Each structure stands twice: as structure tokens, then as C-alpha cells.
């Protein structure tokens, strides 16, 4: 695309410098341009891609929430159309980043990935980016978006269950599916059963790990515990 004159490795190289500088718009466009070179990505290069687009959408989500609350406070004198126009503009920027990621996986990352850890990583991301769209959806397509996210989430679960151990951090990262249930799907008891089953089966697997791996998994198991303490 925009980055077509630059070598694949220089693009990886500059994504890591942007991270250091905290320049995540630059980081995301460098990694978009690497993806469009046509070759599969390694396990470190995949983490760069998710770190870059998460910090960018993370900022849009937070600003959309401020704006939408002012708009609703102005219902329960009136300042004009200005709040609803500006909230609409931000919202359209977020939907555009979500459509850009979703297009890179469809073209052609998911279909080329044959390893369990590649394929489960991309299918999670797909349910994450339909989720962020659902967070701001209100039309007829809102039930359709909730079902695309669901479907992508479930296919990744089935693979992870039969192909990886219960302490794998990509498998624990299932936390996100429980959030889907609680905050999007209006199914809070489903959300609670998943997080408790997930915590329990990892717990009974810790004895098999090194000190470095122990530390990685207990990180994510603590987030499952915080939510249960909040949802009860």
C-alpha cells in the first residue's frame, strides 16, 4: 500500500522505534505495510501488530465514552447539534480502524495460518474487533455484529481446547469471551461459569511449569479473579 517502496525488515525495524517513542499511529501503519508484503508473520511480529492497533483504538474508545455521556446528560437548556455531530465524527473514525484490521485478517492472514497458535491468535483478534464495533452499534446490523463476534470467538475456543494446554497465555487471554458475555450479550451467568472453569483448570496445571512460565500465566489468572470479585 502506502509503504510499498520500503523493505519488509526496515518496516519491522521502525515499528519497534515507534513503540519506544510511544508513537502508535506510526507503529500501526508500519505494520500494516509489512502485512501487505504477502508473507506470514512470526510470533514476535504478531505481538507488534496487536500492540499497535490496540493502543490506537484504545484512545478512540475512551474519547467516544466521554462524548456519549455529555450527549446523554443533555437529555436527562440545549446547546445545539454540536455534541451529536462531534460524537458522530469520532465514532466514524473508530469504525474505520476496526474495518481496516478486519480486512487484513480476511486478506489473507486467517486462511494462510495452519499452526494452532497462529490460527487461534487471529481468530481471537477477529472477535475482539467485532466486539468494539458492537460497543457503539444501535441499528439493525447490531444483532448481526454480535453474532459475527460470537462465531469467531467459539471457533478459537474449540481449537484451543483440543490443541493447547490450559495454562497457555493465548488460551487464557477466554477472559475476553467472558467479557463479551457480561457486557455485550446480556448473559452474566454464562460469563461467571466460564471464568471459574477457566481459573480452576489452569490452577491444577501450574506444577508442570518453569518459573518464567508460571509468572506469565499467573498474570492473566489474576484478571479472571478480579472480574469474579466484581461480578458477585
Amino acid at each position: 500500500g502506502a509503504m510499498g517502496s520500503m523493505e519488509r525488515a526496515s518496516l519491522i525495524q521502525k515499528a519497534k522505534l515507534a513503540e519506544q517513542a510511544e508513537r502508535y499511529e506510526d507503529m500501526a501503519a508500519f505494520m500494516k505495510g509489512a502485512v501487505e508484503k504477502g508473507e506470514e508473520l512470526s510470533c514476535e511480529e504478531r505481538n507488534l501488530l496487536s500492540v499497535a492497533y490496540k493502543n490506537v483504538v484504545g484512545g478512540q474508545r475512551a474519547a467516544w465514552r466521554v462524548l456519549s455521556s455529555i450527549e446523554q446528560k443533555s437529555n436527562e437548556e440545549e446547546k445545539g447539534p454540536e455534541v451529536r455531530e462531534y460524537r458522530e465524527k469520532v465514532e466514524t473514525e473508530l469504525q474505520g480502524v476496526c474495518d481496516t484490521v478486519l480486512g487484513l485478517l480476511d486478506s489473507h492472514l486467517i486462511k494462510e495460518a495452519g499452526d494452532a497458535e497462529s490460527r487461534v491468535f487471529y481468530l481471537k483478534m477477529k472477535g475482539d474487533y467485532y466486539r468494539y464495533l458492537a460497543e457503539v452499534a444501535t441499528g439493525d446490523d447490531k444483532k448481526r455484529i454480535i453474532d459475527s463476534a460470537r462465531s469467531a470467538y467459539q471457533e478459537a475456543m474449540d481449537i484451543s481446547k483440543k490443541e493447547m494446554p490450559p495454562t497457555n497465555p493465548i488460551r487464557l487471554g477466554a477472559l475476553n469471551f467472558s467479557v463479551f458475555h457480561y457486557e455485550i450479550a446480556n448473559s452474566p451467568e454464562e460469563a461467571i461459569s466460564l471464568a471459574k472453569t477457566t481459573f480452576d483448570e489452569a490452577m491444577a496445571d501450574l506444577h508442570t511449569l518453569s518459573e518464567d512460565s508460571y509468572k506469565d500465566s499467573t498474570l492473566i489468572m489474576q484478571l479472571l479473579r478480579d472480574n469474579l470479585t466484581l461480578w458477585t
Partner: peptide, 10 residues
């Protein structure tokens, strides 16, 4: 407040 989702890898 809202629920915790999975953190930025690094």
C-alpha cells in the same frame, strides 16, 4: 466500573 480485558503483551 467496567470489566478487565486482556493486556498489551509487552
Amino acid at each position: 466500573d467496567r470489566s478487565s480485558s486482556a493486556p498489551n503483551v509487552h
